[PDB]
Curated annotation (Swiss-Prot):
Self-association state and partner proteins as the record states: Interacts in vitro with VCL/vinculin as well as to the SH3 domain of SRC and, when tyrosine phosphorylated, to the SH2 domain of CRK. Interacts with GIT1. Interacts with NUDT16L1/SDOS. Interacts with PTK2/FAK1. Interacts with PTK2B/PYK2. Interacts with ASAP2. Interacts with unphosphorylated ITGA4. Interacts with RNF5. Interacts with PDCD10. Interacts with NEK3, the interaction is prolactin-dependent. Interacts with PTK6. Interacts with TGFB1I1. Interacts with SORBS1. Interacts with PARVB. Interacts (via LD motif 4) with PARVA/PARVIN. Interacts (via LD motif 4) with ILK.
Span of domain LIM zinc-binding: 8-65
Purpose: Cytoskeletal protein involved in actin-membrane attachment at sites of cell adhesion to the extracellular matrix (focal adhesion). Recruits other proteins such as TRIM15 to focal adhesion.
Protein name in the entry: Paxillin
Top-level taxon of the source organism: Eukaryota
Name of the gene: PXN
Similarity comment: Belongs to the paxillin family.
Residue numbers of the full-length protein present here: 527 to 591 of 591
Compartments (UniProt record): Cytoplasm, Cytoskeleton; Cell junction, Focal adhesion; Cytoplasm, Cell cortex
Lineage, highest ranks first: Eukaryota, Metazoa, Chordata, Craniata, Vertebrata
Modified residues (Phosphoserine): 7
Post-translational modification: Phosphorylated by MAPK1/ERK2. Phosphorylated on tyrosine residues during integrin-mediated cell adhesion, embryonic development, fibroblast transformation and following stimulation of cells by mitogens.
The species this protein was found in: Homo sapiens (Human)
């Protein structure tokens, strides 16, 4: 069986069995947590956020700078 809950991946509304990203309290499957700009892919390890949405540090560095 998985863990106790699994945390729903914001966007999937389904538990995250395995690694899990935690944004503004919103979770995301480590593969569904993408940049709210290019939507290519994203990781809390080095992402950024603006207007309440994720953005790769390179993106934020491109949008915010
Ligand atoms: Zn998901
Ligand atoms: Zn991006």
């Amino acid at each position: 069986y998985h863990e106790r809950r699994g945390s729903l991946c914001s966007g999937c509304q389904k538990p995250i069995t395995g690694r899990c990203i935690t944004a503004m309290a919103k979770k995301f499957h480590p593969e569904h947590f993408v940049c709210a700009f290019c939507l290519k892919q994203l990781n809390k390890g080095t992402f950024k956020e603006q207007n309440d949405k994720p953005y790769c540090q390179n993106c934020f560095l491109k949008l915010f700078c």
